[PDB]
Symmetry: C3
Subunit: 179 residues, 3 copies
């Protein structure tokens, strides 16, 4: 024996040196891991803040877009109602109102004034109005001597004429062209 | 010799105690690292879910905003067309339609009715219409004895008057104030 | 003694074997940690890219939504102005314009034409216009013999009638129904 002990101590020393080197490298690696995962934890923590902020802006946006969608839908329906109901300056097909109409100063057709303000200062004619048979080519016989029937005919036609003047006046008054 | 072996065993023991303490601390650190990085992995996994969900809401929003942008542009163009084409209640400059106009009941100027419904019940006058020279200050000589020429003058002026009544009636009919 | 050295070497061997096994397991764990935290670092790095991209799309959206909000508000105010100012085809309450009106071809009431283009070709009557007292039931005495006063009465009433024709013509001209 004797020799075996020296051999054993040397080989134990060899293993000790191997353990020492491997522990050193483990220590290096773990010290390296400590810093890096700590950095990751801080990076993850910071990311949650940003994601939370973004979530706070997305649900806000989703609400505003929904509100705007409602406003535009309302607007589109107001436009559609107007489009069907408004009186156009350019439309060529005759347009009709369900109401009376009042305008300032004049009504015109094709750019020339045809209707204005009511003409006042009229005293309404009285008597009979003639809207019946009326012949403007009615003539009258006039002899060289006085004939009652011929003067009666003239007077009769004067009456029918005055009664037709009143009838026309009545029509103007009823419309409102004169007072 | 002899002594060297005891010295060697003691110093080997010293190193063994040092290795034992350092292995213990490594074990502590690595066990600590195991839990923490596992927590980070779970936190990263959870973050991907939230980010994916948010990405799912952002591309959706970008589509809706684009669709609303198109709707509003369409609406703004419908408004612009109306603004230029509509008849205003407050505008003071004369406004013109490219079409005929129909209204209920009346036309008014300055708040007083000047035009209404067509007046009916008329029998159209026949004969000549006089829209020519007409003097309302025309007078007539009347002697104390019968004079044919003086009665002819009266009859002649009655005819021109009846023919002017028809002319005026013709104008009213053509417009449509009377039937 | 003697025996103690063998006992010491064996127990040192026992500890060496224990250290060797624990170092092996530490090495396994740390090699496992190396890969996993590296994966986490890459995953965190990739997440920052996506979050940055999303942040780049959210502030963009917040700007567009704000711009659209301004456009719709502007549109809603243009609609409100129109709603109050436009002339309705269906409204039944009388509507009034602050301006004159011009139309193509005709004005109608209740679907029948009552007003058209100005009637031309007229020669304006001259003299006095009579808008005063006028009795259409005025009659005339006609004797069987010539009576100056009776012919004067007829002539007088013819003058008042011709002067009333001019007055009516004057009213039509002033409105614009005739030239
Ligand atoms: Ca030993
Ligand atoms: Cl990690």
């Amino acid at each position: 024996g004797a020799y075996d002990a020296q051999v054993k101590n040397d080989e134990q020393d060899v293993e000790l040196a191997d353990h020492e080197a491997r522990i050193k490298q483990l220590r290096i690696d773990v010290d390296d891991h400590e810093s890096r995962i700590t950095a990751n934890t801080k990076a993850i923590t910071a990311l949650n803040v940003r994601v939370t902020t973004a979530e706070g802006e997305i649900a806000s946006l989703q609400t505003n877009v929904s509100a705007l969608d409602g406003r535009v839908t309302t607007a589109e329906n107001n436009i559609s109602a107007l489009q069907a109901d408004y009186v156009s300056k350019t439309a060529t097909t005759s347009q009709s109102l369900a109401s009376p109409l009042n305008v300032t100063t004049s009504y015109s057709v094709g750019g020339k004034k045809v209707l204005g303000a009511r003409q006042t200062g009229w005293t309404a004619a009285t008597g009979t109005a003639n809207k019946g048979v009326f012949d403007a080519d009615l003539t009258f016989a006039v002899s060289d001597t006085y004939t009652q029937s011929e003067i009666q005919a003239i007077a009769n036609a004067l009456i029918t004429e005055r009664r037709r003047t009143k009838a026309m006046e009545d029509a103007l008054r009823a419309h409102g062209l004169i007072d």
